[PDB]
Design a protein around this nucleic acid. Structure first.
Ligand SMILES: Nc1ncnc2c1ncn2[C@@H]1O[C@H](COP(=O)(O)OP(=O)(O)OP(=O)(O)O)[C@@H](O)[C@H]1O
Ligand SMILES: Nc1ncnc2c1ncn2[C@@H]1O[C@H](COP(=O)(O)OP(=O)(O)OP(=O)(O)O)[C@@H](O)[C@H]1O
Ligand SMILES: Nc1ncnc2c1ncn2[C@@H]1O[C@H](COP(=O)(O)OP(=O)(O)OP(=O)(O)O)[C@@H](O)[C@H]1O
Ligand SMILES: [Ca+2]
Ligand SMILES: [Ca+2]
Ligand SMILES: [Ca+2]
Ligand SMILES: [Mg+2]
Ligand SMILES: [Mg+2]
Ligand SMILES: [Mg+2]
Lengths: 319, 319, 319
DNA sequence: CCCCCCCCTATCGAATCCGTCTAAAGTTA
DNA sequence: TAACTTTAGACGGATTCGATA
């Protein structure tokens, strides 16, 4: 795991400076080593000499140089993937949701995004040999659609206990964009004490549709969204967790020659499109069956799979 | 290749001055000869007389005068071009990616920038008669989307061995703009010992969108980006490698100007527009096919070509 | 042609003073006659009495008095103009590029500055009755985008010999502002022996953007630019060559008053604005067609024209 | 041949683009 | 017992420094 920030104290830094860094938002040596000088300067009690000394001391404990592709391949071969509860989706994703990156799921209503989030929140607590991540879960809720009964129903299927499954989920509700960004600092503070395997934001872009209204507020909205996504990436790199965000759709009214993937576009613009690593397009099939399509990925071919929303969570279609 | 800076000691320079120069970031005689006097002055242990003597000796060791266009033509006729793995793109570029200059590829998401980067990283190790550059590769990664399995697939396509292909790639991950600029000094130090042929930065402008937010920081952002591009150009000139960078896009919301010409504009502004030599525009086609268009070039006419992203890298569309 | 500085020996000047002046950078009687006293004083081996004697002899050898406007009209009616390869541009400029003055072309990327420079470099060698200048071309390259194949294409278009066209062009690459200024002394040295007709600097302000960074270095940058422009003007006056330089653009990010048309401004400021005699503004049209506009001139009305970039250089739009 | 002091002046020189949103409407035995 | 097409508007935003005889 990451090294606590207290190591800098014996590395040769004043305890007051470490305290100031702690209230700034940094809680590990890695978080300090990943920040630019201008971010540390903004702290009231930090001067240029203090900043460069802190950066030089932090750079010794964290490797930030060159390496080979063989070492990276060996390190990545030991990464953890979390099963989704459906064999078809697992085969489509070649194992399940990866850790250390950002995954995004978008689609129209009743397509099964909250259901997948609930199933993953339950599943991330299984032992590794059974397909789990063996950790706790964090659930930042934006719309107000969190239902623990679905968690209990999913936990019943895998033969776990309901009480300690509900004990391992942390829930928070965000009421505006400022609160949504503020919750991430407390999330970073919490992750040093225990071990977390998953962090869920649902929905990521729901409040930006209303907080910033017209074309006159577009640039500020995009800048705020970019800052939020950068913080999410920093958390994923620092703690090695899996981040799953949820998006919405918008219509195309120009009536031009676009008939593939329907006149549906995910909201957020180019910012969220470039930031995300994997994008999944969710569509409705027949009855309780849905269709999942690989929309964007650096290593996964474009394909399709079929799953269903059963009484015990997300599972294969019963035919 | 370039001359090591140790020759200045024989030319009559104190070894301590050479050590100071190496600590500053100059590892070859060419890097010293190309630097202005005010850059050498900034070093703590160098005076005006020492700078003048060093510059005089370096100029004595490097040809920096007038020549004839016939000699330039003869020298350029022996340049090395690296194939992209697609016949259509090779015909469009009249041979492939050209060393000694900066090439930029931009477009929206899943258009194929990272796939082309992986294919080039594998291909730059082929023998010259087979379309390669016969050298190692350097991959500075910004977003966290490096996947060695794609490298293994592309290597399997060409019949090479996976192990040494992975051994011949150097990987580094940048976490901020300062770290991204800092990695170039280590790259310059590395390139003296072994022969390289390609250097990928992907993405080159991803961290600038978030490190500097508003209009109040535009000037500093542009200055930092200009300095980074100048360092890249100096590396390309000194070592004769091919530099390939990757860019993103921004929307035009001003109104009903222009026409339906895909109102997407690359980011970076006039600095990156003027600095780049060749610019490639990537567009999404149908299925797995993509379209590449020549956006800017001093010797290549505007045209288009089609390629596909197959299971073994970038190649021609199978129709 | 100008009188070589060796003529002063017959006027009562020691060879020591003559070679000291030559080492200083003076190679003709006109150069000495136009220089102020303090410039001669700055030379180590020249005292005040020697400087006064040299100035008196030079003023004897060179006419520096009052004349009438009819004589000026008669001498100006014999001026030489070089065609640009396009009939409409020649009509706009009323003959072509004038010798003895400084012309500046600016615009954004792929607007056709380098193509025009290549076309002019080939064209300046045609016979006078064909629209040429009957001389050699000097090309000072700053960015590294010199391609002799375009020269070969234009020479093939005009039915010349490619070998001779390539042989009659002198090429030099500049790496910093100091080198850019230092190359002018060698240019002045070479212009004495052979008859040159064109001097191209492309780009003139590319290195000034990165060599001097912020507002703290504005004054030194502007003074260096002013000295460079003054030396260019001295060369144009002394040898009667045509001086064509290239500029870049910068965005305007405030004050939407009379600026909604085009928020593009050339760089360099009032120094280059006042120094330049004629300024041309290039725009992007449709396809391969571009638009040229008169931005500043002492004798030409403000108008517009249209040209195109073809496979054989700059020509007329094929409609 | 002898023994002690006086006083400021004058401005220069521009840079740097960003960021998408919004579905509607039945018809003809 | 089936096959059928058109439609248009909308805006705001901020900061930067050195140079002498
Ligand atoms: N216990 C259950 N058994 C079966 N299906 C259920 C159960 N609970 C919910 N569903 C299904 O969940 C579907 C809605 O999925 P979900 O709540 O994930 O929507 P969503 O994609 O998040 O939508 P929105 O954009 O409105 O938030 C419904 O169509 C319903 O059939
Ligand atoms: N093994 C594979 N087989 C087929 N297609 C693949 C494979 N791996 C990736 N792809 C394709 O690669 C595409 C994404 O391309 P790429 O990763 O180069 O995007 P990009 O241009 O770098 O985007 P971004 O701006 O998100 O970084 C996907 O659409 C996917 O279909
Ligand atoms: N052989 C050719 N045939 C047709 N067009 C060509 C040919 N070679 C180059 N071009 C055109 O030249 C254009 C670029 O022109 P040029 O190199 O003069 O640009 P520029 O304004 O000098 O740019 P920069 O600011 O980057 O230096 C491209 O848009 C390309 O279409
Ligand atoms: Ca992406
Ligand atoms: Ca360019
Ligand atoms: Ca003028
Ligand atoms: Mg939901
Ligand atoms: Mg990518
Ligand atoms: Mg050019």
């Amino acid at each position: 795991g990451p090294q606590p920030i207290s190591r800098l104290e014996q590395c040769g830094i004043n305890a007051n400076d470490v305290k100031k860094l702690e209230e700034a938002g940094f809680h590990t040596v890695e978080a300090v080593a990943y920040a630019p000088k201008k971010e540390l300067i903004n702290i009231k009690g930090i001067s240029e000499a203090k900043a460069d000394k802190i950066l030089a001391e932090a750079a010794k404990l964290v490797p930030m140089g060159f390496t080979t592709a063989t070492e990276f391949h060996q390190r990545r071969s030991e990464i953890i993937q979390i099963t989704t509860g459906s064999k078809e989706l697992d085969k489509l994703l070649q194992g399940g949701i990866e850790t250390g990156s950002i995954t995004e799921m978008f689609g129209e209503f009743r397509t099964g995004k909250t259901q997948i989030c609930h199933t993953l929140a339950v599943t991330c607590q299984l032992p590794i040999d059974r397909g789990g991540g063996e950790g706790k879960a964090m659930y930042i809720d934006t719309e107000g659609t969190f239902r623990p009964e679905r968690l209990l129903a999913v936990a019943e299927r895998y033969g776990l206990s309901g009480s300690d499954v509900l004990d391992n989920v942390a829930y928070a509700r965000a009421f505006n964009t400022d609160h949504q960004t503020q919750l991430l600092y407390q999330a970073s503070a919490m992750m040093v004490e225990s071990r977390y395997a998953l962090l869920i934001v649902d929905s990521a872009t729901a409040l930006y549709r209303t907080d910033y209204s017209g074309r006159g507020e577009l640039s500020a909205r995009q800048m705020h969204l970019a800052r939020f996504l950068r913080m999410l990436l920093r958390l994923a790199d620092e703690f090695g967790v899996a981040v799953v965000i949820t998006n919405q759709v918008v219509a195309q009214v120009d009536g031009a020659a676009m008939f593939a993937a329907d006149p549906k576009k995910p909201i957020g613009g180019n910012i969220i499109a470039h930031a995300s690593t994997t994008r999944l397009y969710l569509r409705k099939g027949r009855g309780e069956t849905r269709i999942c399509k690989i929309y964007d990925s650096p290593c996964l071919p474009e394909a399709e799979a079929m799953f269903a929303i059963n009484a015990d969570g997300v599972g294969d279609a019963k035919d």
